[PDB]
With several copies, the nearest count.
Chain A
């Protein structure tokens, strides 16, 4: 029921930006 993701597309920025914003606000707080 679990599938290894394929190296399709190029890259996604939504998840990376959200994680970076969360880490930065955590550090500042």
Chain B
């Protein structure tokens, strides 16, 4: 209505436009199909012609040895020393690297009763109980422990545990024959014993047509109870930004965003010095603080990341080594998460300005006055939800793999509401107290707790309309 709110609206629209451009300029198409073709080539390909097993359905160590000498070498090396082009467009950078992590024999306390029959025990993976000694023909780097600081590694947080960056590693070759010979000699002298706990394969490609590196990491975990758990990660990155004019445009937009964030920071700091000290009793101020801190964190991450390109320069100095691009991919994932969260919050900040008439004002007031009761009832709702989740975890937590973990129990309970749970497995997991849980949960969610939310909303909306009508009609 007056000039200050108009200025605020104009500034907010400019900031939103800047964010929209910045987010659109980093999530274009042709990035999905890149990773899609890579995944189809490496994951879905059967390990050999005579077997229908692939990487996604590995089941034993012999299957892993078949995959390593099979679909991996077919998907890495393509014929036109010579360089390898994956799809005649994707260039394999340097050499791939394989690395295993293992524990030491005697990391247990075998019970005295059975000490006469079982002699070997290997604990589950832990930093305090991992092997650091040579084994086999202790000549190369595949039979000698190398510390984390000497490998430039970092943690991974796999499915079972969080694995260290150290281990026993081997750098493969640039040609298929040498890599095949290396893997054959690594398999003949048994490299994966009963102590092996994890295995990693890492490499990267370039695809010079577009400007996008791709980093590939494949992990295989061997639990202490026997078996194989495979997982994968394909991640595209951009490290040579300033190649075209659009990149300069994006850099200018980034500088403008930095200026906007500085202006918002100085405004917020100038507000709470004496004026309305402890002004945190408003929603639109806490939202601004959250947006500011998230943007500052994102800016700091971007500055600390883009200034770390020494690995690329080192690889470009000598193109016969292993390119180490895992940290860049990790920080890119973190930056993407932060950017998505902050863009979501700046988008939902738009409700501060949609009050142009009486209908929008009435709806906004109703939503504002529903917050307290909805939170008060959500406390009870989540208490009941957590009690049910704990019961389901304790009952089905070893057979149904929808309740195999507490957070998995919560997600399964949320999916039950949508009615996409089989109920066939939880029937046979426990014939009594299994169906009881399901029926009682359905009855108490659909009949007692949804209607309570609806009743609260109805009453609050009616009261707000009555109060607003009385206020408006008594001038």
Contacts and interface: CB of A to CB of B under 8 A. Distances in A.
Interface string B126-167: 111000000000000000000000000000000000000000
Interface residues of B, number: 3
A4 B152 CA distance: 28
* Main DSSP-derived SS at the A contact region: loop
B29 to A, nearest CB: 45
B55 to A, nearest CB: 29
A9 B108 CA distance: 12
A25 interface: no
A7 B128 CA distance: 8
Contacts of A7: 127-128
B9 to A, nearest CB: 43
Nearest to A9: B126
Contacts of A9: 126
Nearest to B124: A10
B1 to A, nearest CB: 43
Contacts, number: 7
Contacts of B128: 6-8
Interface string A1-29: 00000111110000000000000000000
Nearest to B129: A8
B149 to A, nearest CB: 18
A9 B128 CA distance: 9
Contacts of B126: 8-10
A10 B127 CA distance: 11
B123 to A, nearest CB: 11
A17 to B, nearest CB: 13
A10 to B, nearest CB: 8
A8 B107 CA distance: 12
Contacts of A10: 126
A9 B126 CA distance: 8
A1 B126 CA distance: 27
B388 to A, nearest CB: 20
Contacts of B127: 7
B275 to A, nearest CB: 34
A8 B126 CA distance: 8
Nearest to B126: A8
B387 to A, nearest CB: 16
Contacts of A6: 128
Interface in B18-76: none
Interface string B107-129: 00000000000000000001110
B406 to A, nearest CB: 12
B176 to A, nearest CB: 42
A8 to B, nearest CB: 5
A8 B127 CA distance: 8
A26 to B, nearest CB: 19
Contacts of A8: 126, 128
A7 B127 CA distance: 8
Interface string B449-474: 00000000000000000000000000
B20 to A, nearest CB: 43
A20 to B, nearest CB: 14
A21 to B, nearest CB: 15
B221 to A, nearest CB: 16
A9 to B, nearest CB: 8
B3 to A, nearest CB: 48
A18 B378 CA distance: 26
A6 B126 CA distance: 12
A10 B126 CA distance: 9
A6 B128 CA distance: 8
A24 B274 CA distance: 38
A7 B126 CA distance: 9
Interface string B197-221: 0000000000000000000000000
Nearest to A8: B128
B112 to A, nearest CB: 22
A13 to B, nearest CB: 12
A17 B128 CA distance: 26
A23 B128 CA distance: 33
A9 B127 CA distance: 10
Interface of B: 126-128
Top 4 closest A-B pairs, CB basis?
Answer: A8-B128, A6-B128, A7-B127, A7-B128
7 contacts: A6-B128, A7-B127, A7-B128, A8-B126, A8-B128, A9-B126, A10-B126
Interface of A: 6-10
